[PDB]
Amino acid sequence: IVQGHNQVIHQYFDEKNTSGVLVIQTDKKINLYGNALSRANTEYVPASTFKMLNALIGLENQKTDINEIFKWKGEKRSFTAWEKDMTLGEAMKLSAVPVYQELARRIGLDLMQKEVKRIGFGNAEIGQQVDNFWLVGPLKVTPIQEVEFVSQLAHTQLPFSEKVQANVKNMLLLEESNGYKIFGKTGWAMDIKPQVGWLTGWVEQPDGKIVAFALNMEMRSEMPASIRNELLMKSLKQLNII
């Protein structure tokens, strides 16, 4: 059974002509799948997977709250009465918005570095620019570290207030189907070489059991962003997690 799972997911990644790993954490037990398992213990920039930690830090330190609406000058919008208010939670899901850069600036370099060190996220190095360190470095983290982080979040085990953790978890719901809930966060560092893509999160199964995941793969510019979600979903189905 296990050998079949291994073979099929390796092939799924090969079919996309790139290198990737899927880390699965189930009750202290970690399994690796994909065609480039060595990625699991390799450090990469977290890209916007860091939004999870940014939100925790910002909320814990009262630099924002879940009701604040953010605004900026951008492309002309239409039918805004049908757009969700631009809260921290809404911005969690959105690409190329400046909300999390603004939050990082409110937190400030010193507090951000102190918190990242306290959490021990990846190499815990944020350098001197508080509003982009997750995208271009120097902060890096392994896929195993990411799955452990998100598993702790899912279980309310991170060293933040229970309410803050609950609030951030609520921002991360991607889809619910037949009582299964998939929570998670994408990331894509497009401006570094090689590019890195992430999808880190967890499944809450109907009976309440939690299975955490971290997908990490090499991206190319011609890929649709959804390649990450596609690989995740077919792999979770193969593993009978969903």
Side-chain angles (χ1 to χ4, degrees):
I1 304 180
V2 177
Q3 294 163 348
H5 288 338
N6 296 336
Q7 193 287 317
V8 171
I9 294 165
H10 188 301
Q11 191 173 325
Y12 286 166
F13 280 84
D14 283 341
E15 292 166 352
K16 300 300 190 185
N17 305 289
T18 195
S19 302
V21 67
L22 175 62
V23 186
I24 300 296
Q25 184 176 343
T26 302
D27 285 285
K28 291 209 284 186
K29 177 168 179 172
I30 290 187
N31 287 93
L32 308 180
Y33 305 96
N35 66 354
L37 305 188
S38 62
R39 297 183 70 89
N41 289 288
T42 300
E43 289 183 331
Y44 303 97
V45 300
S48 284
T49 66
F50 187 78
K51 288 189 179 174
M52 296 187 280
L53 184 49
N54 196 357
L56 291 164
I57 294 166
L59 291 170
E60 184 79 23
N61 288 281
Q62 298 180 294
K63 300 301 181 185
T64 187
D65 60 68
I66 62 171
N67 302 128
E68 179 173 3
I69 300 177
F70 294 83
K71 68 169 92 295
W72 64 88
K73 302 166 60 178
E75 290 301 328
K76 194 76 190 68
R77 310 241 172 179
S78 58
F79 302 103
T80 61
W82 298 98
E83 297 279 3
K84 295 270 174 50
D85 293 334
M86 190 62 64
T87 59
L88 193 60
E90 175 66 10
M92 180 68 76
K93 300 97 169 148
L94 298 176
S95 311
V97 296
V99 171
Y100 284 77
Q101 295 162 340
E102 167 63 21
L103 182 55
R105 292 189 292 265
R106 292 184 189 179
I107 293 164
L109 193 76
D110 300 322
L111 178 58
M112 185 77 81
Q113 180 64 91
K114 179 171 64 63
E115 287 274 13
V116 165
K117 179 178 184 178
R118 184 180 66 91
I119 298 317
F121 186 84
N123 67 3
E125 303 173 18
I126 78 167
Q128 297 300 308
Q129 184 172 348
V130 77
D131 62 5
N132 78 351
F133 58 83
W134 56 90
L135 272 182
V136 302
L139 183 61
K140 299 190 178 66
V141 62
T142 74
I144 287 167
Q145 288 174 318
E146 284 229 349
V147 84
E148 292 171 341
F149 171 86
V150 84
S151 183
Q152 288 177 298
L153 177 60
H155 291 282
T156 319
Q157 296 293 316
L158 289 173
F160 291 101
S161 109
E162 293 180 66
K163 172 189 129 294
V164 166
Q165 293 182 76
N167 285 341
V168 173
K169 292 165 61 181
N170 288 340
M171 305 176 181
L172 295 169
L173 182 66
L174 294 175
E175 190 175 0
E176 180 169 356
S177 183
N178 194 36
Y180 289 77
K181 296 179 181 185
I182 305 181
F183 293 84
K185 184 73 202 75
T186 55
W188 187 347
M190 299 177 190
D191 293 336
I192 66 168
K193 277 78 215 75
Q195 299 178 35
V196 63
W198 290 98
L199 176 40
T200 297
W202 67 98
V203 178
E204 180 187 334
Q205 298 178 323
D207 71 357
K209 289 181 182 56
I210 291 164
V211 180
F213 58 81
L215 181 147
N216 175 285
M217 60 184 284
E218 183 170 323
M219 301 294 289
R220 292 186 298 277
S221 301
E222 71 269 18
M223 289 176 178
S226 62
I227 194 171
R228 299 163 301 177
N229 311 68
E230 179 187 337
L231 285 163
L232 176 69
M233 295 301 284
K234 68 181 73 176
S235 297
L236 295 178
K237 285 169 183 186
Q238 165 68 196
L239 294 169
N240 303 129
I241 294 165
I242 62 176

